[PDB]
Every structure is written in structure tokens, then in C-alpha cells.
Write a protein that binds this ligand. Structure first.
Ligand SMILES: OC[C@H]1O[C@@H]2O[C@H]3[C@H](O)[C@@H](O)[C@@H](O[C@H]4[C@H](O)[C@@H](O)[C@@H](O[C@H]5[C@H](O)[C@@H](O)[C@@H](O[C@H]6[C@H](O)[C@@H](O)[C@@H](O[C@H]7[C@H](O)[C@@H](O)[C@@H](O[C@H]1[C@H](O)[C@H]2O)O[C@@H]7CO)O[C@@H]6CO)O[C@@H]5CO)O[C@@H]4CO)O[C@@H]3CO
Length: 214
């Protein structure tokens, strides 16, 4: 009778040294009970995660599996502990099996990409098009300069199709795709679509959750 959860949060010391802030994780398009979030972790950050606020699941729970693909260095005995300071893409997959959930936690490298007509029409992960990564909690990811004109497209890289984890700028805010998108973001609304030309760059700040074309 159980279905996969609709919400995921993360909580811990890289957000609030008091564990009082719960980051709601963005949901992976078209795939149920999978979530992703771009977070800076300090060295020996401690965190847990949960489905609702004030649920605390940690590394020792037998429903839980960790997969490190970022060299974050994940360990701990209750809390999750991330050894190496860095931006990482925190990624959770909750699947039903039996009457309980079964979590897969994956750290992906902080890899953000420009796609689409703004790039001369790359529709695949291509390292010419990867944002540089800021050193601090508060820096920006910045794209390389665009080489053509059109709608801007942006995504993170995972083991899934790119467009399942892509996003844009609505009103200075970072908006993660949550509908069926075919030709353009204007399918959502305008000032969801974001018009670029040769020379432009994006700045993203994922701590704030904002960004801007420049
Ligand atoms: O500020 C105090 C506290 O701050 C930080 O703790 C974090 C913690 O690391 C996070 O995991 C989270 O805690 C969650 C738990 O994850 C969650 O399971 C639940 O915890 C309940 C326990 O399962 C239950 O056994 C009992 O906890 C007891 C605990 O066994 C005792 O040890 C005692 O806790 C004290 C710590 O021992 C002490 O080191 C310090 O904790 C710091 C911690 O170092 C830091 O990382 O103080 C605490 C108590 O103040 O007492 C508790 C019961 O009081 O009951 C808890 C339910 O509370 O819930 C907690 C969140 O409350 O978040 C905390 C920060 O809040």
C-alpha cells in the first residue's frame, strides 16, 4: 500500500551549527521518491536526513546505503560525517521494498552544465560547458561564456538523464523543473525562460538559491 515519499529534507551543521534549519530537497522530474540538492559541506560536517521535518535518519539505519562518487569521504556512527570540505550534489533515492523504505544516498561531484542553443546546440555532457566551482560556501558557480543566442538551459550531472535534474532562473530565484518540458521554459510561464546571447554568463549561488545573467 505504501508509495514513495514526496518530500525530503536534509539537516545539519553545514546549514545551522544548531541543527535548526531543514533544507527541502528538490525532486527529480518524472522519478518518484528521488531528490537532489547542491550543498556546500565543511570538513567534518554532520548531517542527517528525513522525509518530514523532525524525522532524523542517519548512517547506521539498516534501510540506508551510501555511495560516494565525489570523494566526499562519508562516515560516522550515527550522524553522517563528510570528511572533505567541498560542494557536493547531495542525492537521495527512497524506494518502497517490503512495507518499509530503502534509501540510497549518493554524493555526486559538484558538476553544473550549460546546454542548448546558447552553446551552439550541445545536448550532452560536455566539459567545455561546465561551470567553474567556487571555493567558499558563498561563491558562485559561473558558466563559461555562451557562443550563440537562444534559451538558456542548465543542469546537474548524475547517473540519470540530464533533463531530470535541470533548472532555471525565475525572478532571480533558482527554479527546478517540475513539469513536462518539450521545446522551452515559456511552457511554464515567462521569466521562467531566460534569453542569452554570445558573451553572457550565469552566476549561481546555491546557498542563497539565487542567480543572475550577466
Ligand atoms: O545541542 C545539543 C547537541 O547538539 C548537536 O546534536 C545534534 C545531533 O547531532 C543531531 O543528530 C540531532 O539530534 C537528533 C537525533 O539525531 C535524533 O535521533 C533525536 O535524538 C533522540 C535520541 O535518539 C534519544 O536517545 C535521546 O537522546 C538523548 C541522548 O541520548 C543523550 O546523549 C543526550 O544528548 C545530549 C548529547 O549527549 C550531548 O552531546 C549534547 O548533544 C549536542 C551534540 O553534541 C551536537 O552534535 O546534548 C544532548 C542533549 O542536549 O540527551 C538526549 C535527550 O535529551 O533523545 C533524543 C531526542 O532529543 O533527536 C535529536 C535532536 O533533538 O540534532 C542535535 C541538535 O539538536
Amino acid at each position: 500500500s505504501l508509495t514513495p515519499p514526496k518530500t525530503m529534507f536534509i539537516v545539519g551543521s553545514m546549514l545551522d551549527t544548531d541543527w535548526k534549519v531543514w533544507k527541502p530537497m528538490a525532486g527529480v522530474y518524472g522519478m518518484d521518491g528521488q531528490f537532489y540538492s547542491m550543498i556546500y559541506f565543511d570538513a567534518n560536517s554532520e548531517f542527517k536526513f528525513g522525509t518530514k521535518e523532525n524525522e532524523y535518519i542517519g548512517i547506521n539505519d539498516n534501510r540506508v546505503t551510501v555511495t560516494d562518487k565525489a570523494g566526499a569521504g562519508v562516515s560516522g556512527s550515527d550522524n553522517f560525517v563528510v570528511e572533505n570540505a567541498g560542494w557536493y550534489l547531495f542525492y537521495v533515492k527512497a524506494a518502497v521494498k517490503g512495507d518499509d523504505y530503502q534509501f540510497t544516498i549518493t554524493f555526486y561531484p559538484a558538476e553544473v552544465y550549460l546546454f542548448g542553443n546558447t552553446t551552439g546546440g550541445s545536448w550532452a555532457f560536455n566539459d567545455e560547458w561546465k561551470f567553474t566551482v567556487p571555493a567558499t560556501k558563498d561563491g558562485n558557480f559561473v558558466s563559461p561564456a555562451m557562443t550563440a543566442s537562444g534559451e538558456v538551459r542548465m543542469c546537474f550531472k548524475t547517473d540519470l538523464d540530464w533533463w531530470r535534474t535541470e533548472f532555471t532562473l525565475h525572478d532571480g530565484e533558482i527554479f527546478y523543473r517540475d513539469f513536462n518540458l518539450i521545446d522551452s521554459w515559456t511552457e511554464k510561464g515567462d521569466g521562467y525562460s531566460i534569453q542569452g546571447s554570445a558573451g553572457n554568463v550565469i552566476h549561481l549561488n546555491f546557498t542563497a538559491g539565487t542567480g543572475e545573467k550577466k
